[PDB]
Design a protein. Structure first.
Lengths: 109, 190, 305, 245, 158, 65, 79, 103, 42, 135
RNA sequence: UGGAAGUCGGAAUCCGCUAAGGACUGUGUAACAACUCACCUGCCGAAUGUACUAGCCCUGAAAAUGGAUGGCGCUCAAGCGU
C-alpha cells in the first residue's frame, strides 16, 4: 500500500554525535577484555587507483602497437651518473636476490 | 517468365570446319580437330548466315537463356584452339634446392610425362601425366620455364593446374618458403 | 633463452567464444525436468565449474609464461622498460590476475547457490547468471589482451642477449658503419642503408675467436642531447651501454659524412664515458677511404689524443 | 533475382556530378560566346591530354573548354534555328570524338603559330605504332630499362616486381634486387617490350610508362574557327582530313 | 658540369638540417658543414620557420636559395614573438594578418599560382591561411574568401 | 542492509528477513551524502528490491527517494 | 558434411497424437492471450487507414486523374 | 631470427608468385562462400553466424547513413535549471507474485 | 587485336554483351515519350 | 625424448610395477622400487612391466637418504625371469637389478658391480662404457 | 615526430585550373617515389540501379537399438494455391 513513510529518512545522526561515538567505540576496541552490552541494539553499521590513473592518462593502444604514439620512456634516473649508480645497485640487488634464492629428477608426490 | 525465343551467334573463320550432329560439335582447323558433346543442354543449332552459327532456345527460362553464353564461349574456345592454339608458360623457382624437371613422351600411352625431383630436398619423384594433345617443352629462351601447348584449352589449363598442385609446401610458413611451380603467362601459340 | 614459448593471447570476444565453445562441446547438454533435482544441480554445477576451470587454465597460462620483470637481469628488465611501458605491462598482467580471481570467486558463489536451487528453471538462471558475469569480466579486458598479444609477438621476435658472456657492443652516431662492421664480422642480417636510424632495434650476431664464442651487439645510433630528450630507439643503445659489461666499440666518422660534427661526436663520447667505468673502450675511426687521421686538422687530432 | 552483384558504396567525399554539371557547362559555354572574337575547334586524339593545364596557363587571355563532345555541340547549337550566334552551327560539324573549344580574341595566325610550334614528348597510348624497338637488357633491371647507361641509373624499386610479373616480364627478386635472369646477366635473353612497326597494347604502354620511356608526342591539331565579325567558319588543314558529323 | 637541383625542408637559423643531406651530398663531394653554414646563412631571416630551400650543385659546389612557401609567408606575416622549439610545443597560430599583407603574399606567389587573376591568388592565400588557422582582418579567412566571391571586397588587378 | 522492513507475501517472511522481489529493505546511505536540513547525516533509508535474487545471485534495489 | 555416404538418424515427420493435442491447446491459449493483450494494449491505433494509392504502371492514370478533376469540380459547383 | 625478419624476407625475396592472384580470387569468391555458409551451416554455428551477419549489416547500414548526412527534447520550453527533472506515495513495484509456503 | 587487358587474364575471352533477355520489346523514342508522360503524371 | 629405446626386440617382461630390484651402481642406493615403466601401452587392468634394457621410474627405499626423496629414471640391467634372444638362447640372471641414470641415459654412478645384460649394453652406450661384464 | 611529403597520429578540411580530381580510398617507402580508388573524358549501344513487399525454397540446434507424410514411392509430382 502507498505510504508517506517509505520516502523519509529512517535513521539520522549528527556530526559531533557520530564523531564521539566513533572515538569511544575505537577506544573500546583498543581493550580486548571489554565487550559491549546489548550490541544488537547498537548502531554498529556506522563503525564498520594508480593503475586506473595511468591507464586513463596513457591508453594501451597509445603505448605499444601499430597505432602507438609513445616516444619517451619513463625512467628512474636523470643523468649519466645516476644511471651508472642505478645499474650498479640493480646488479648488486639482483646478485643478492639470486644468492638468497640459491640458499633457499622430480620430487615424490 | 519464359522467353519465347533467345539467340546467340558465333562467327566462324574461313579455315574452320564445324560439324554438329545430335549436339556433338566437331571443329577441325589447321592445327587439328576437337570434339565436344553438348547434349546435356537443350539448344537448337542452325546456319543463320554463311560462316555464322546460330544457337537458339525456345520457351526457356532465364537459366536456359543464360546457358547459351557458356555454349557460345565453349565453341568459340574450340575454334580459337584449332586456329591459334593455346600456350601456358610456367616458371619454377627455388630457394636452396634446385628443382629438377624432366620431360619425356610415354609413347605407349602416347602422352607426355613430367618428372619433378629435388623439390625442397625431398627424395620422392613427383610424376604428372599430361592429358592427350598437350605438348611440354623446356624453354631455352628463358630460365627454369616449361611451355604447355595444345588445341584444347581445358586440357592445357588442367595440366598446368596439376603441375601447380603437385608441388605444394606442407607444414611450413608460406611467407618464408616460396618454392613451387607457377603459371606465369597464358596466351595463344600463334 | 628466448620468450617464443608464450602461448598466443586472443582478444576478449575470441576468449569468450573459445571458453563457451569448450563449455558447449566438451560437456553434455541435454537435461530434462523429469530428472532428479540433484542430477539437475550436478549438471549445472559441472557447467559452471568447467567454465571456471577453462578460464583459470587460460589465465594461468598467460601469467605463468610472460616474463617477471623483478626476476630478470637488470639489462633485460630495463630493456623491456624501454620497449614497453613497464607500468602498463604490470597493470595488464595484474588485471589478468584480478579477472582470474574474480572469475573463481563468482564460480564458487554460484556453485554454492546451485547447491540450494530447487528447480531446473532456477538452476538454468543461476548458470546463465554465472556465465554472463564471467563474459562481462572477460569483456572488460579488451585493451590488455591486445596489448599483451603485441608484447608477446615482439618478445618472440626479440633477440637473445646473454648478459654475462664474451660480448662486444658497437655504439656511436648514426651512419658511421656500425651495421657494416657487424655484417663483416658476424653472420647477422642487419640492414645497411645510407639514411639515419636504419637500425631501430638491437641486433646480435656471433663470431669465434681462439675457439671461444663471442656475441656482438649492434645498437641503434645515439644523438647528442640530454638524457631527458632521448627517445626509446636511442635508449635501447643507452640501456645496452649501461647494463652490459661488454667491450664497447665507439665508432666515429671523421669524414663527417654521417651528418654530425666531430665536436658533437666527441661531446657524446664525453657525456657517455661515466657508463664506461669497468668497461673496455675502443674508439674505432671508420671510413678511411674518404678521409684519414693525418688528413684531419691538427687540433682535432690533438683533441682525439 | 537473388544472385546479383553487390554494388559497392563508396566512402569518398567526391560524388557523381549529374545533370547540374551539364547545365553549368551549358551556361559557361553560352556565356563565353559574346566575349571572344574567334572560336577555334581543336583535336587531341589518342593522347594523354595532361598538358592541357599548361596550355590553359600559357593562354591566360583565352578560354578552353574540354567537356563532352555532344554537350559542347548542343551548347554551341547544332541547327541554325537554335544557334547562339550566326555561323556556330557550321562550326558544330567538326565536333566529333575527342575535341575542344578555344574562345579567343587574339590573332588566328598567332594561335595557329603557337599550336604549330607547341610540342611536348609524351607517353604512348594503346593503338599507337611503336617508332622503335625497346628491349630491357638481361641482368639487373633499372628504372629506365636501359634508356640511360646502367652506371647512371638507380635500380628499379622492389615493390614493382609483382607488377612487372603481372605485365609479363619474367623478372625475379634476388637479394632485394629485381633481376631479369640472374644477378650477373646470364642464362636469359633480353625482354623485348615492343618491336618497331607494331601496334602497342595497354600492357606494352604500361610497361613503357613504368620504365619512363616516351614513344609518342602531344600535338594539338586545329580544325577550324568561327569568327564573330564575319559570321563564318574558316576551315584549316586538319579539318579536311578529320571526319565530320 | 652537370647541374643538380635538390629541394629540402629546413628550419631557419639551424645547422642540423644537413644531417639528412650528408647521406646523399657526401657522394656528390660536398662538405656537409659548409652546406649547413650556407643554409643557415640563407635562412637566417626565416628564424624558427619550416622553409623550402633549393640547393644547386655544379662542379662540386652548391649555392643555396630560399623557395617561398605560402604557409611560411603567412606565419612570418603573423609576427609571432620569438621562441625556442625544444621547450614549448603544440603551439597555435591564432594571431592576425592584414588583407594588404595577404595581397602582397599573393603577389609574391604569382610565379607559383596558376590562377588567372590576382583575386584568385589572394583566395588561394586565404585558403592557406585558413588551413594554418590564423585570422585575417579580425575575421575568418573563409569568410573573407566568401565575401570576395560576393563582391563587396574588391581585389586590385595586378 | 540494515533490516528487512516488509516482505509483501507474508509477515512471517518479513520476520525471517527474506529478500525477494518487491521487498522493502533498509540500507545504510552514509556513502551517498544524504543530509538533513541542519547537518545531520541521514544514514538509514528504505529501498525496494527490483530483481529476483533467487534466480540472479545478487540483490538489486532502487532507493525510495 | 558426409551425409551421402553416411546419413544420420532420420527426423520423423509422423506426428504424435499427444504432441498434436498439446500443440492445439497451446495454440488456443496463445490466441486467447493475444486477445487479452490486444484488449489491454495501450499502443496508439489510427482510425483512418493509409491509402495504398494508384500504381504508376497503370497506363490510364492520367485519365483517372481527369475524371477525378471534373468530379470534384462538379461537386464543388453543386455544393 | 630477430626483429621484423618476415618483413625483411619479403623485402629481400618477395612473396609467392601466385599470392596476389590467389588473394584476388579468394576475395572474389567470398560472396559465394558467404551465401553458401548462410544456406548450409547447421545448428548453433548457423545461429551464431546469422547473429554476427545481422550485426555487420546494422553497422554497415549505420556507416552508410553517417556518410550520407556527413553534410547536413521535451514539449514545454523550460529553462536550463529545470531540465532533466521529473501526491501518490507509491513504491516503484506496488505488486509482485505471491510466494506459497512450499516455494 | 584486343588493345586492352582482362583482369582474370583470359585473353581469349570475347567482348561479351549485356545479358538483356527483354531486348527489342520496345523502341527508344517510345520510351522517351513514356518518360515525358510519367514525368507530367507524377 | 621420453626415454623409449628404439630397436629393442621383444622379450619377456619380468618386472611389473611394484617390483623391488637391486641398485647395481655406486650412486648410494641399495634397492629400487618400480612405480612405472617408460613406453607402457594402455590396457585395462594390466600392470606395466619392463625387461632388460627398459627404462623405468623408481624410488629408493634403502640407500643414502637424499636419494629417497626423488623419483629416478633407471635402466634394468639384470632380470631373473628367463627370456629368449634371437639366437634361440633362453637365459636368466641371478637377480633383478638396475642402475639409476638421467633422462638422456648417462649414469649417475661411476661403476657397475656385477654383469649387465646384452640388451641394456646395446641400448645404452654409457652402461656399455661403465660395465665390466657383458652377458 | 628520429623520420611522417593525402595514406603511424590530433584538429581543421579552403581555393584555383577545371571535363574532373578528397588537404584523399587502399597497396607501398625509413621518408620520397610508384600504383590505385572517388570523379571526368573517349569507344560501345538501350535499358538499368537502390530499398522494400508478397509466394515457394535453404538455414534458423541435434543426441544416443534400426524406421517411418501409414508403406512403397513420387520431381511440367503421386508436392504447393485456386
Ligand atoms: N666510404 C665508406 N663508406 C662507408 C664505410 N662504412 C660504411 N659506409 C657507408 O656509410 C653508411 C652507414 O651505414 P651503416 O653501416 O648502417 O651505419 P649505421 O647506419 O650507423 O648503422 P646502424 O645504426 O646500425 O643502422 C653505409 O650505407 C655505407 O654506405 C666505409 O668504411 N667507407
Ligand atoms: Mg644508416
Amino acid at each position: 500500500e502507498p505510504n508517506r513513510k517509505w520516502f523519509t529518512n529512517t535513521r539520522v545522526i549528527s556530526q559531533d554525535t557520530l564523531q564521539s561515538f566513533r572515538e569511544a567505540m575505537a577506544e573500546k576496541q583498543k581493550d580486548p577484555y571489554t565487550v559491549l552490552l546489548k550490541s544488537n541494539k547498537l548502531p554498529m553499521s556506522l563503525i564498520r587507483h594508480q593503475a586506473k590513473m595511468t591507464i586513463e592518462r596513457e591508453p594501451f593502444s597509445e603505448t605499444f602497437g601499430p597505432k602507438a604514439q609513445r616516444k619517451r620512456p619513463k625512467l628512474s634516473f636523470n643523468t649519466v651518473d645516476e644511471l651508472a649508480g642505478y645499474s650498479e645497485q640493480s646488479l648488486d640487488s639482483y646478485h643478492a636476490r639470486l644468492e638468497e634464492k640459491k640458499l633457499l629428477s622430480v620430487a615424490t608426490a | 517468365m519464359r522467353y519465347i525465343h533467345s539467340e546467340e551467334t558465333i562467327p566462324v573463320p574461313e579455315n574452320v570446319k564445324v560439324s554438329i550432329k545430335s549436339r556433338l560439335v566437331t571443329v577441325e582447323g589447321p592445327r587439328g580437330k576437337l570434339q565436344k558433346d553438348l547434349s546435356h543442354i537443350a539448344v537448337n543449332f542452325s546456319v543463320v548466315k554463311k560462316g555464322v552459327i546460330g544457337l537458339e532456345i525456345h520457351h526457356g527460362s532465364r537459366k536456359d537463356v543464360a546457358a547459351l553464353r557458356t555454349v557460345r564461349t565453349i565453341i568459340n574456345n574450340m575454334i580459337i584452339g584449332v586456329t591459334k592454339g593455346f600456350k601456358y608458360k610456367m616458371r619454377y623457382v627455388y630457394a636452396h634446392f634446385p628443382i629438377n624437371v624432366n620431360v619425356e613422351k610415354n609413347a605407349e600411352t602416347g602422352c607426355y610425362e613430367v618428372e619433378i625431383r629435388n623439390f625442397i630436398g625431398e627424395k620422392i619423384v613427383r610424376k604428372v601425366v599430361m592429358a592427350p594433345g598437350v605438348e611440354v617443352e623446356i624453354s631455352k629462351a628463358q630460365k627454369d620455364e616449361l611451355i604447355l601447348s595444345g588445341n584444347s584449352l581445358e586440357a592445357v589449363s588442367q595440366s598446368a593446374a596439376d603441375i601447380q598442385q603437385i608441388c605444394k609446401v606442407r607444414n611450413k610458413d608460406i611467407r618464408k618458403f616460396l618454392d613451387g611451380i607457377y603459371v606465369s603467362e597464358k596466351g595463344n601459340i600463334v | 633463452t628466448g620468450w617464443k614459448d608464450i602461448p598466443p593471447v586472443p582478444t576478449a570476444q575470441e576468449f569468450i567464444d573459445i571458453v563457451l565453445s569448450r563449455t558447449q562441446r566438451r560437456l553434455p547438454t541435454q537435461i530434462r525436468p523429469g530428472f532428479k533435482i540433484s542430477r539437475i544441480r550436478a549438471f549445472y554445477t559441472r557447467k559452471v565449474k568447467f567454465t571456471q576451470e577453462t578460464c583459470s587454465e587460460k589465465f594461468g597460462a598467460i601469467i605463468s609464461s610472460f616474463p617477471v620483470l623483478s626476476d630478470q637481469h637488470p639489462f633485460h628488465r630495463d630493456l623491456m622498460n624501454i620497449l614497453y611501458d613497464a607500468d602498463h605491462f604490470k597493470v595488464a598482467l595484474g588485471q589478468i590476475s584480478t579477472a582470474k580471481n574474480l572469475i573463481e570467486t563468482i564460480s564458487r558463489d554460484y556453485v554454492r547457490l546451485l547447491k540450494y536451487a530447487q528447480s531446473l528453471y532456477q538452476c538454468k538462471q543461476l548458470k546463465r547468471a554465472a556465465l554472463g558475469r564471467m563474459a562481462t569480466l572477460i569483456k572488460r579486458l579488451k585493451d590488455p589482451l591486445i596489448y599483451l598479444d603485441q608484447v608477446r609477438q615482439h618478445l618472440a621476435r626479440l633477440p637473445d642477449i646473454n648478459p654475462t658472456t664474451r660480448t662486444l657492443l658497437v655504439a656511436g652516431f648514426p651512419n658511421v658503419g656500425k651495421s657494416s662492421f657487424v655484417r663483416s664480422v658476424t653472420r647477422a642480417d642487419t640492414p645497411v642503408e645510407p639514411y639515419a636510424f636504419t637500425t631501430k632495434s638491437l641486433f646480435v650476431g656471433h663470431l669465434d675467436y681462439k675457439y671461444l664464442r663471442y656475441q656482438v651487439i649492434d645498437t641503434p645510433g645515439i644523438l647528442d642531447h640530454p638524457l631527458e630528450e632521448m627517445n626509446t630507439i636511442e635508449m635501447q643503445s643507452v640501456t645496452a651501454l649501461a647494463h652490459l659489461r661488454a667491450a664497447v666499440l665507439y665508432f666515429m666518422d671523421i669524414s663527417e659524412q654521417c651528418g654530425f660534427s666531430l665536436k658533437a661526436q666527441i661531446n657524446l663520447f664525453k657525456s657517455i664515458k661515466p657508463l664506461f667505468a669497468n668497461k673496455m673502450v675502443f674508439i674505432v675511426l671508420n671510413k678511411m677511404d674518404i678521409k684519414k687521421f693525418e688528413e684531419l686538422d691538427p687540433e682535432m687530432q690533438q683533441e682525439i689524443n | 533475382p537473388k544472385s546479383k552483384r553487390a554494388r559497392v558504396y563508396h566512402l569518398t567525399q567526391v560524388n557523381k556530378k549529374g545533370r547540374e554539371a551539364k547545365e553549368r557547362l551549358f551556361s559557361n559555354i553560352r556565356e563565353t560566346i559574346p566575349k571572344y572574337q574567334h572560336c577555334f575547334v581543336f583535336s587531341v586524339d589518342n593522347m594523354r591530354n595532361n598538358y592541357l593545364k599548361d596550355v590553359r596557363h600559357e593562354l591566360n587571355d583565352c578560354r578552353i573548354f574540354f567537356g563532352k563532345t555532344k554537350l559542347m555541340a548542343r551548347a554551341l547549337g547544332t541547327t541554325p534555328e537554335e544557334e547562339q550566334a550566326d555561323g556556330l552551327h557550321r562550326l558544330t560539324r567538326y565536333l566529333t570524338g575527342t575535341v575542344g573549344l578555344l574562345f579567343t580574341n587574339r590573332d588566328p595566325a598567332d594561335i595557329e603559330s603557337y599550336f604549330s610550334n607547341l610540342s611536348q614528348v609524351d607517353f604512348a597510348r594503346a593503338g599507337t605504332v611503336a617508332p622503335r624497338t625497346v628491349t630491357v637488357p638481361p641482368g639487373i633491371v633499372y628504372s629506365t630499362g636501359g634508356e640511360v647507361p646502367p652506371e647512371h641509373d638507380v635500380p628499379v624499386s622492389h615493390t614493382l616486381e609483382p607488377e612487372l610479373r603481372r605485365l609479363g616480364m619474367p623478372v625475379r627478386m634476388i637479394k632485394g634486387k629485381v633481376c631479369l635472369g640472374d644477378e650477373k646477366g646470364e642464362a636469359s635473353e633480353g625482354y623485348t617490350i615492343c618491336k618497331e612497326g607494331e601496334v602497342l597494347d595497354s600492357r606494352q604502354t604500361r610497361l613503357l610508362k613504368l620504365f619512363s620511356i616516351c614513344l609518342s608526342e602531344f600535338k594539338v591539331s586545329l580544325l577550324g574557327y568561327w569568327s564573330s565579325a564575319s559570321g563564318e567558319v574558316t576551315e584549316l588543314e586538319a579539318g579536311k582530313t578529320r571526319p565530320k558529323r | 658540369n652537370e647541374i643538380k637541383i635538390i629541394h629540402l625542408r629546413a628550419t631557419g637559423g639551424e645547422v642540423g638540417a644537413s644531417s639528412a643531406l650528408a647521406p646523399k651530398i657526401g657522394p656528390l663531394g660536398l662538405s656537409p658543414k659548409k652546406v649547413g653554414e650556407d643554409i643557415a646563412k640563407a635562412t637566417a631571416d626565416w628564424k624558427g620557420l619550416r622553409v623550402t630551400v633549393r640547393l644547386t650543385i655544379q662542379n662540386r659546389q652548391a649555392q643555396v636559395s630560399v623557395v617561398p612557401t605560402a604557409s611560411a609567408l603567412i606565419i612570418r606575416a603573423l609576427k609571432e614573438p620569438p621562441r625556442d622549439r625544444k621547450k614549448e610545443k603544440n603551439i597555435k597560430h591564432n594571431k592576425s594578418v592584414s588583407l594588404d599583407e595577404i595581397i602582397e603574399i599573393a603577389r609574391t606567389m604569382r610565379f607559383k599560382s596558376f590562377s588567372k587573376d590576382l583575386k584568385g591568388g589572394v583566395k588561394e592565400i586565404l585558403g592557406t591561411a585558413f588551413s594554418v588557422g590564423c585570422q585575417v582582418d579580425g575575421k575568418s579567412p573563409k569568410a573573407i574568401s566568401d565575401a570576395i566571391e560576393a563582391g563587396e571586397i574588391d581585389i586590385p588587378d595586378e | 542492509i540494515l533490516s528487512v522492513k516488509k516482505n509483501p507475501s507474508n509477515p512471517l517472511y518479513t520476520q525471517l528477513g527474506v529478500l525477494t522481489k518487491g521487498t522493502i529493505i533498509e540500507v545504510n546511505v552514509s556513502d551517498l551524502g544524504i543530509v538533513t536540513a541542519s547537518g545531520k547525516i541521514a544514514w538509514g533509508r528504505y529501498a525496494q528490491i527490483t530483481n529476483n535474487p533467487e534466480n540472479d545471485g545478487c540483490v538489486n534495489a532502487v532507493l525510495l527517494v | 558434411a558426409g551425409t551421402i555416404n553416411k546419413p544420420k538418424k532420420p527426423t520423423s515427420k509422423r506426428k504424435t497424437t499427444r504432441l498434436r493435442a498439446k500443440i492445439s491447446k497451446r495454440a488456443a491459449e496463445k490466441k486467447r492471450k493475444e486477445r487479452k493483450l490486444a484488449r489491454k494494449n495501450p499502443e496508439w491505433r489510427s482510425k483512418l487507414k493509409k491509402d495504398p494509392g494508384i500504381p504508376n504502371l497503370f497506363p490510364y492514370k492520367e485519365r483517372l486523374l481527369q475524371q477525378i478533376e471534373e468530379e470534384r469540380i462538379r461537386r464543388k459547383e453543386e455544393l | 631470427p630477430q626483429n621484423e625478419y618476415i618483413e625483411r624476407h619479403r623485402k629481400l625475396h618477395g612473396r609467392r608468385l601466385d599470392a596476389e592472384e590467389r588473394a584476388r580470387k579468394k576475395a572474389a569468391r567470398e560472396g559465394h562462400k558467404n551465401s553458401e555458409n548462410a544456406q548450409n551451416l547447421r545448428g548453433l554455428r548457423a545461429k551464431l553466424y546469422a547473429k554476427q551477419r545481422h550485426a555487420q549489416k546494422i553497422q554497415m547500414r549505420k556507416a552508410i547513413k553517417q556518410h550520407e548526412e556527413r553534410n547536413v527534447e521535451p514539449s514545454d520550453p523550460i529553462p536550463s535549471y529545470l531540465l532533466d527533472r521529473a501526491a501518490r506515495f507509491s513504491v516503484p513495484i506496488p505488486k509482485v507474485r505471491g510466494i506459497s509456503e512450499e516455494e | 587485336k584486343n588493345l586492352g587487358m582482362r583482369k582474370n587474364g583470359q585473353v581469349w575471352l570475347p567482348a561479351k554483351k549485356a545479358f538483356r533477355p527483354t531486348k527489342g520489346l520496345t523502341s527508344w523514342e517510345l520510351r522517351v515519350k513514356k518518360r515525358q508522360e510519367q514525368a507530367a503524371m507524377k | 625424448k621420453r626415454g623409449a629405446p628404439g630397436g629393442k626386440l621383444k622379450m619377456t617382461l619380468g618386472l611389473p610395477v611394484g617390483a623391488i630390484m637391486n641398485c647395481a651402481d655406486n650412486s648410494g642406493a641399495r634397492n629400487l622400487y618400480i612405480i612405472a615403466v617408460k613406453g607402457a601401452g594402455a590396457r585395462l587392468n594390466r600392470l606395466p612391466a619392463g625387461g632388460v634394457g627398459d627404462m623405468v621410474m623408481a624410488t629408493v627405499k634403502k640407500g643414502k637418504p637424499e636419494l629417497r626423496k626423488k623419483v629416478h629414471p633407471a635402466v634394468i640391467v639384470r632380470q631373473a625371469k628367463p627370456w629368449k634372444r634371437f639366437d634361440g638362447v633362453f637365459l636368466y640372471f641371478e637377480d633383478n637389478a638396475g642402475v639409476i641414470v638421467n633422462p638422456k641415459g648417462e649414469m649417475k654412478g661411476s661403476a657397475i658391480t656385477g654383469p649387465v645384460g646384452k640388451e641394456a649394453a646395446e641400448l645404452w652406450p654409457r652402461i656399455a662404457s661403465n660395465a665390466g661384464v657383458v652377458m
